[PDB]
Structure formats: C-alpha cells, structure tokens
C-alpha cells in the first residue's frame, strides 16, 4: 500500500538552513535530531502556554501568554530577540 503521512519539519529546517547558510548540507540523522528538537521545545512551550493560560483562569491561548512563556523558558539571549521578532511577525501578519 501507500504508507500514511509521518509528521516532520524537514523541508522547513532545510530551507531555513539555506537562509542562514546557502551552501551548507545536512545529514539525515542530524535532521532527525532537529525534528526531535523542534517537537520537544514546541511541546515544552505549548505546555507552558496552555498551563499559564489555565493558571490565571483563562480559556484562550493568545500571543501574550506565549510571549510570556517563551520568556519563561528561553533565557535572555534567547528572549528579547525572540520576543522582538515575534511581535514584528505578529504585527506584519495582522497588517496583511
């Protein structure tokens, strides 16, 4: 038969690699490392987001509690840069 789809971020990781390094290759095992990475950190931040929304008695995931949480997990260097481009991405998303 034709097998079911397995969820992976491989093509996006490849193209952001090309954005940061247009000539650098990638191996498959390292790419699976990266997929496990993005799944793990996404689960961490999404669990923190869902909790911190529940914890103040709120039933809606928004951008505010996840900028709060990204700042919770990611440390300073991984923080102000992340929150800054996140807000400009959100504003350019709502602008369009």
């Amino acid at each position: 038969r034709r097998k079911t789809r397995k969820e992976s971020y491989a093509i996006y990781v490849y193209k952001v690699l090309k954005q940061v390094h247009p000539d650098t290759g990638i191996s498959s095992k390292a790419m699976s490392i990266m997929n496990s990475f993005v799944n793990d950190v996404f689960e961490r931040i999404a669990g923190e987001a869902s909790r911190l929304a529940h914890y103040n008695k709120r039933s809606t995931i928004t951008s505010r509690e996840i900028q709060t949480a990204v700042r919770l997990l990611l440390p300073g260097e991984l923080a102000k840069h992340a929150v800054s481009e996140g807000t400009k991405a959100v504003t350019k998303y709502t602008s369009a």
């Binding site: 923190e48 914890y55 509690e65």
Partner: protein, 82 residues
C-alpha cells in the same frame, strides 16, 4: 530605593541554616558567597514569579505565583495551594 541590604542575611542566620543541615564547623568565606548563592536563586525565582505576576495584569506578587514558579523550576513547595 532600598540599597545595601544583601548583608541582611546575617552571619548567625547562615550558621543556623547550616546547623539544621547537620554540619559541624563552618569556613569563614562561606557567608558572602552563600549570600551570592541566595542572590542567584532568589533572582531566578523572583523572575519567574514577576513574569507570572505581570501576565495577570497584576501589580501585586501573589504567594500563588510563588508556588507556581517553584512548580516550574523543580523546587516546588507544599502548603500554599495547588
């Protein structure tokens, strides 16, 4: 603006905390760098607590947010709500 209270963790109090731990004899330069240890632990705890605080549009730090942040970092506390 309050300033220069870091010495407020007084020398016999650091001793007393040690003597609950079961140690006998205390080195002399323990006190100031353990005050620094309290400083780093309290700063990351209070950072998580004030982050929880300002998410709730709040200007008051709640004990709820304190035990909340302790649940986050692996140093959780009991007796102040779940």
């Amino acid at each position: 603006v309050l300033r220069d209270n870091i010495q407020g963790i007084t020398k016999p109090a650091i001793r007393r905390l040690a003597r609950r731990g079961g140690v006998k004899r205390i080195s002399g330069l323990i006190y100031e760098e353990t005050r620094g240890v309290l400083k780093v632990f309290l700063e990351n705890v209070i950072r998580d607590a004030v982050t929880y605080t300002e998410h709730a549009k709040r200007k008051t730090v709640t004990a709820m947010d304190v035990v909340y942040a302790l649940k986050r970092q692996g140093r959780t506390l009991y007796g102040f709500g779940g």
